[PDB]
Design a protein around this ligand. Structure first.
Ligand SMILES: CC(=O)N[C@@H]1[C@@H](O)[C@H](O)[C@@H](CO)S[C@@H]1OP(=O)(O)OP(=O)(O)OC[C@H]1O[C@@H](n2ccc(=O)[nH]c2=O)[C@H](O)[C@@H]1O
Lengths: 695, 7
């Protein structure tokens, strides 16, 4: 009972976030009573929370040696092994805990989550249901289940699920517990803004709690640029310097920074994945530091501080791989959110969020903990001009008597190939070459029809767009620019030659009932037309098809293709007529992708950062006619583009040209504007002031 | 595999 009171106290000091004190109390409990299984297990769990994974494991095992049937110890040990990347060990522990006690809800829940992580959503759903059957009041499992259902577009009892999620959050916030809705998912659910911000705030808080065990004094911050030779030292922190959307967006930025005024440090939180993305940022940043080698957040934060950073840039927010503990320690005087996280941190330790007028209107400053820092056009950027320059121009094959998106060719050497051909006509839009239906045109269509990998014409390499990984797998990933001419066709994807193709290439989770109802209305108004979606994941397809069948759409109206390699995904968007953006959460990376192909995108900005990104893209692009202020307008715009064909041609021509002539894909201009904004942020603070809106 | 933004 002496030992128990120590243990019970420790448990509460832990509930509180007083980790150091909890650890001490458990140790004292074990000094008093060494064979205390519960204290070993609890101590193990808090060591795990602090990253001491081997030590934890040792205590979990002592706990199990003391009590062989301690299912809880196995379950938590399983989580430790999962944190160590030992999936097999984790499964062994979870399944052992369930064997010991099949009514143990938490174990079922932990098992479900490793199913989810491994790509087995149906089994994850099943285990979360078992968990909730065993323990109907289980917020973590209910909300995790809700996300799985979202991913596969299972909208059974949707509206009740939604308000169930809201009440769960309200209750948890009431009681100052950690909300079971992850901040990153909070945009998908009809929560209030105060709730979205609060959720983020409470998750930020976990980082503050973890760093207090270190007891660091505040860091002292440069007040001028004298020791940096008049250069603003900017630190980009990311787990995504590698093959990840982030790098696909901003890999050129570090090397475009003006070294006369800036000194760029990239802090990677991930190890080198061997990809050209990582190679490029390592090569072009003035300094590159691999913090994945320095897992103690104390020592890593010191490094940032000695480097002398003025502006530290948080590119993760609440995404996989984050180490926001680093920002909690405030190792730099100005700390800003940029690009990677489409929401607020809700945290005190972040000063600004880099955004824009269209994405984050001044009116909604309430929704963010950070001050608004406006880029002048969009805060979004993409590396498409560098990654996919072979898509800057295109030619077509005139299969009948003229379409821009049925049979398409792209290539760095396309001009030379076309010049080798007898009868090429040039359609002014600047222009689109047209290969007439001759023997050449026939050989190409025959390679495609026969699913052959490539052929040669007049000494030029002509590649089947479906076979890029077999020809050059670095060109498929976007790590290299293709060195052959590539052919892309509607027939390759079973798309109709003679109808409008509306597309959306986002993960299926971004779709909701209202959204699919809009799409179905649009398709009913445009007979012939199809909606082109991805198996992202495949098990979402029959759900989408069923809800569409119930809205009165025959099945052939929605066509699914597999997820493609990066370059093919971007290239194949040239086959669509129009992209219908997801209002609940827009295409972000995905939006830049579709626009680079010349494909107009219809969107309806909403009430969250994530639902307004596409509209910002389109604004910067200069295509305000594609932004809807409501559902009727979205449908009307979309029906207009699918029926008024001269208007379609006009609007496509405008996107096709403005992707070059506008700022949207202009990384040099973006970097220079980003540099102005950085100096504004710097003056305002050097002049002794503190964070305030910048517009 | 196709990397994506995740929580
Ligand atoms: C909601 C959210 O987090 N959004 C984030 C943004 O707010 C951040 O700015 C970005 C931060 O780095 S990433 C992110 O942008 P999103 O549009 O959501 O795309 P997501 O994260 O699902 O990735 C799909 C990928 O599959 C690729 N993709 C897609 C289809 C295909 O067939 N092949 C393929 O390679 C695509 O090229 C993509 O690379």
């Amino acid at each position: 009972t002496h030992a128990d009171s120590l243990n019970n106290l420790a448990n509460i000091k832990r509930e509180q976030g007083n980790i150091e004190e909890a650890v001490r109390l458990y140790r004292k409990a074990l000094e008093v009573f060494p064979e205390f299984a519960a204290a070993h297990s609890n101590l193990a769990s808090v060591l795990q929370q602090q990253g001491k994974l081997q030590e934890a494991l040792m205590h979990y095992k002592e706990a199990i040696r003391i009590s062989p049937t301690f299912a809880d110890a196995y379950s938590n040990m399983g989580n430790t092994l999962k944190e160590m990347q030992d999936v097999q060990g984790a499964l062994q522990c979870y399944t052992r805990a369930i064997q010991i006690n099949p009514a143990f809800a938490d174990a079922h829940s932990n098992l479900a989550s490793i199913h989810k992580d491994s790509g087995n959503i149906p089994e994850a759903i099943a285990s979360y249901r078992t968990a909730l059957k065993l323990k109907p009041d289980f917020p973590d499992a209910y909300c995790n289940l809700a996300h799985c259902l979202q991913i596969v577009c299972d909208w059974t009892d949707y509206d009740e699920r939604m308000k169930k999620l809201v009440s769960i959050v309200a209750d948890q916030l009431e009681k100052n517990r950690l909300p079971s809705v992850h901040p990153h998912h909070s945009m998908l659910y009809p929560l209030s803004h105060g709730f979205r911000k609060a959720i983020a705030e409470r998750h930020g808080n976990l980082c503050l709690d973890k760093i207090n065990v270190l007891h660091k004094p505040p860091y002292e911050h440069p007040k001028d640029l004298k020791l940096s030779d008049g250069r603003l030292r900017v630190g980009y922190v990311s787990s995504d310097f590698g093959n990840h959307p982030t790098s696909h967006l901003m890999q050129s930025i570090p090397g475009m920074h003006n070294p006369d005024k800036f000194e760029v440090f990239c802090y990677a939180l991930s190890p080198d994945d061997g990809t050209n993305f990582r190679v490029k940022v390592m090569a072009e940043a003035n300094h590159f530091i691999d913090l994945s080698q320095i897992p103690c957040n104390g020592k890593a934060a010191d490094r940032i501080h000695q480097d002398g950073i003025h502006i530290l840039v948080n590119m993760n927010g609440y995404t996989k791989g984050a180490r926001n503990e680093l920002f909690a320690l405030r190792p730099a005087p100005i700390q800003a959110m940029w690009l990677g996280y489409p929401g607020t941190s809700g945290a005190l330790f972040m000063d600004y969020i880099i955004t824009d007028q269209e994405t984050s209107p001044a009116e909604v400053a309430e929704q963010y903990s950070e001050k608004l820092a406006y880029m002048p056009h969009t805060f979004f950027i993409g590396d498409h001009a560098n990654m996919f320059p072979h898509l800057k121009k295109k030619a077509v094959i005139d299969f009948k008597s003229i379409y821009d998106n049925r049979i398409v060719l792209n290539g760095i050497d396309l001009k030379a190939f076309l010049d080798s051909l007898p009868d090429v006509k040039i359609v002014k839009m600047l222009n689109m070459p047209v290969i007439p239906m001759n023997t050449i045109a026939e050989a190409v269509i025959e390679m495609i029809n026969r699913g052959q990998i490539q052929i040669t014409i007049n000494g030029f390499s002509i590649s089947n767009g479906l076979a890029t990984t077999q020809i050059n797998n670095k060109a498929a990933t976007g790590e290299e620019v293709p060195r052959t001419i590539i052919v892309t066709t509607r027939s390759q994807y079973g798309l109709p030659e003679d109808a409008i193709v509306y597309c959306n290439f986002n993960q299926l989770y971004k779709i909701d009932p209202s959204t699919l109802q809009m799409w179905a209305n649009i398709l009913k108004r445009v007979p012939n037309s199809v909606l082109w979606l991805l198996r992202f994941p495949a098990v979402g397809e029959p759900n989408i098809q069923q809800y569409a069948q119930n809205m009165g759409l025959p099945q052939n109206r929605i066509i699914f293709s597999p997820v493609a390699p990066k370059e093919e995904h971007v290239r194949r968007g040239q086959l669509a007529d129009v992209c219908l953006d997801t209002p609940l959460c827009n295409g972000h990376t995905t939006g830049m992708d579709v626009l680079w192909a010349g494909t107009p995108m219809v969107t309806m900005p909403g009430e969250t950062l994530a639902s307004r990104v596409a509209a910002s893209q389109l604004t910067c692009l200069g295509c305000l006619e594609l932004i809807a202020k409501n559902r009727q307008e979205y449908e009307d715009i979309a029906v207009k583009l699918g029926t008024d064909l001269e208007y379609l041609k006009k609007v496509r021509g405008k996107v096709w040209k403005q992707r070059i002539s506008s700022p949207l894909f202009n990384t040099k201009q973006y970097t220079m504007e980003l540099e102005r904004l950085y100096l504004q942020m710097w003056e305002h603070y050097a002049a002794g002031n503190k964070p305030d809106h910048m517009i | 595999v196709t990397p994506v933004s995740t929580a």
